[PDB]
Amino acid sequence: NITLILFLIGILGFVLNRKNIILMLISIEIMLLSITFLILLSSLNMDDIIGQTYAIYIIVVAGAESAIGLGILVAFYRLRGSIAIEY
Amino acid sequence: MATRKPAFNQHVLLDTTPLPDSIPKVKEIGASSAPLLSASFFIGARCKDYNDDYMQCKNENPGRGEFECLKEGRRVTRCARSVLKDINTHCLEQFRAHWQCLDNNNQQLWQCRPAEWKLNKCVYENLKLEKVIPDQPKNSTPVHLRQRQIFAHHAIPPWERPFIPGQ
Amino acid sequence: DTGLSRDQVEREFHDQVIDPTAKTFKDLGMEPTDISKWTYHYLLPYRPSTYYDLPPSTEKEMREERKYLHVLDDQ
Amino acid sequence: SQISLLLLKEIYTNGSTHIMLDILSVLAVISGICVIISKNPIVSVLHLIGLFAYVSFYLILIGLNFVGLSYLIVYIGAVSILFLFILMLINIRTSELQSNTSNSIPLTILVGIIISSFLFKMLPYGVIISNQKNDLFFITSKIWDGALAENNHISSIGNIMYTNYNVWLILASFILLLAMVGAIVITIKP
Amino acid sequence: TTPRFWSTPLKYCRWAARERPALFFSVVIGALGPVTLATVPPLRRLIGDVDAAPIPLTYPIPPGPRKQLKGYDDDTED
Amino acid sequence: PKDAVHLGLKGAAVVGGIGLLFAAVRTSLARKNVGPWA
Amino acid sequence: MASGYGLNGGPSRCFPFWQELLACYVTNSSEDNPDGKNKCIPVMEDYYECLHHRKEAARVRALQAAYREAEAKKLQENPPTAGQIRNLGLLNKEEDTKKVHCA
């Protein structure tokens, strides 16, 4: 239930935000944690170590994609000098 | 109830309803962990067949092994009880020495070798039950018959010897 | 001094009434300045000056940023 | 007759309090809300770390100790540190980042009711049985053949993740290799 | 001045040992993993160093039909 | 037979609710601060 | 779940239900009789029951109601206390064991 509310918070990050692109990166991190938390709790209910394994690979991949996204942001910011959307 | 490890239990639920009379009664084993552990290989020596038969009965009836293996469950309790009756009538002092050492030493069998060797000898000379561990490396002395223990907190004195039957 | 006391709470209901039969700065050749002339001077060190707090960049500012590299890639 | 069922408090070997999950749940939501309404992005990431800790603390207390500590080491220990380094080096005017959130509030309500009403119906009983007189208690007992040599959760993962499921590990390794080569290629002068 | 590996492999190896010791000996230690994986277990077999059998991590169910034991039945109680 | 008025109300509600959805997006994508009551 | 590897290094608790369901499908479904997979329906429902427990929850909610309605009608003249129950089945507390058992 908490995991569902957290997914909304990550969803709501995209609704409320017109100009903060950094918040877009953070809202993906919230969504991914919410989905991993749901898998972890379900894996506990169904006594299944595969759920924990799936969550570990989501942490690995979401950590890997955070680094790519920050690198892409750095290449973007090197040329623009701002992460602000003019709106 | 489920075999899940609890994390938030604050209560214990008991049920006083007995077993139906149609099921033959049985006296449950009344021995604590440490005595059971000092007598485990002795129980294994005498009741291995009944232990195996009980486990095989359950495997023959998957999902139903609790029921329809009760009669074989009762045998395993009686045989083990015979070993704890025989030991308590013939090796009581040596038995209490080993399980009291075990209870004081984190139930680690390698911490109480002198007390074990004394009991092993007495049990063998009255009950003909001998400790056996399958598949120990043939190129080394059996770990339970080694004069020195690497992981022992106190060094085994040199006047306390392992019990090898036939010597 | 907590800035708060019984006779101080009472003092805040009272309103400064100026005696008309008393010498003023006039008699001394002085002209007092108004407090609104001094707030900026005395409170300037209390206004935040972090880069986070400047108002948004003008289009003049947005265009000049594109004349600079904003990360040292060789370092 | 008599009272066949006896309920009494456990004295030792008691177990954790289920109350503490509720504080951790509410603190995660408050921290979650503080992430997307924070003025400064750095303060938004600081609230994100608090959200990571509360989830990690929650996972630890229910017995998921390895994954809970993995969250602390990985997400707070390295991902969040990378986010704050970049955020605290770049030039940010907080004024340029403030959207009028009141204009997004009617859509915020509509999105919340629509999405919640659909995904909640999809949550299996395990996640919805104990949230929102006659209450249901969970019962637990021992087994002996299953408890011969228990593995910790990290051991149980280790027993299969290199053998039975090692294709996942290879796939993850190539993803990590792509990330290192990629992030390097686009940032540094050759 | 630095030697080239593909033209003179041995000269490069000496230079790397002396001029990049940390990098060179990481490769040497890393390659010792596979080398001991090929040498020692054959060596151990010849000398008679036999591998220990795995310890039981589950109940060792006996293979075969049940033995049909007759003992410790209900009449033996009390 | 069928209830013409009752069916129309359901008809009006279902596709009007999506219009209420599209109306909130316009308010959300509004540039000037118009508040939540727009 | 269906993986067969549980949290303590043993097998997953619903795996026998999952093996049965697969066993029923493979041996009763085929190309000749597409309706043979109908037999596998109660087996499927058992598997979902092991995972989620919605039936067992429903059964105990009803049974707790009847149980907690019978205890209100009866009057407990002297119910056992927590201390005495803690003495149940002990080496020198027969009186507490007898009192709790109403023997």
Summarize the structure.
Chain E has two helices and no strands. Chain E has helices at about 10-20, 20-45. Chain G is an all-alpha fold and about 100 residues long.
Task: Give the number of helices of chain C.
Answer: 4
Give the total of beta strands of chain C.
Answer: 0
**Would you list the SSEs of chain C in sequence order as H and E?**
HHHH
Envelope shape of chain A = elongated
The helical percent of chain A reads over 70%
| N→C terminal distance of chain A | 36 Å
Taking Cα atoms only, what radius of gyration of chain A do you get, to the nearest Å? 16 Å
Structural class of chain C, by secondary structure, is mainly alpha
Feature tags:
part of a larger assembly; 7 chains; A: 87 residues; mainly alpha; Helix Hairpins; F: 38 residues; 1 helix; mitochondrion inner membrane (chain B); disulfide bond (chain B); repeat (chain B); NDUFA8 (chain B)
Describe this structure in words.
The structure is cut from a larger assembly and holds seven protein chains of seven kinds. Chain D has 190 residues and is an all-alpha fold. Chain D has helices at 19-37, 41-61, 65-87, 105-119, 125-128, 153-161, 166-187, and one strand at 5-9. Chain D has one domain (18-186). Chain D has seven helices and one strand. In chain D, helix 1 runs antiparallel to helix 2 (41-61) and helix 2 packs antiparallel against helix 3. Chain E is rod-shaped, with a radius of gyration of 30 Å. Chain F is mostly helical. In chain F, 68% of the residues lie in helices and 0% in strands. Chains in contact: A-C, A-D, A-F, A-G, B-D, B-E, B-G, C-D, D-E, D-F, D-G. Chain D binds chain F through residues 100, 102-107, 110, and chain F through 20-21, 23-25, 27-28, 30, 32-36, 38.
What's the structural blueprint in terms of helices and strands?
The structure is cut from a larger assembly and holds seven protein chains of seven kinds.
Chain A: H1 2-16, H2 21-45, H3 49-80
Helix pairs in contact in A: 1-2, 2-3
Chain B: E1 11-15, H1 33-38, H2 40-60, H3 70-90, H4 92-104, H5 113-127
Helix pairs in contact in B: 2-3, 4-5
Chain E: H1 9-19, H2 21-47
Helix pairs in contact in E: 1-2
Protein name (chain G): NADH dehydrogenase [ubiquinone] iron-sulfur protein 5
Disulfide bonds (chain G): 14-50, 24-40
Subcellular location (chain G): Mitochondrion inner membrane; Mitochondrion intermembrane space
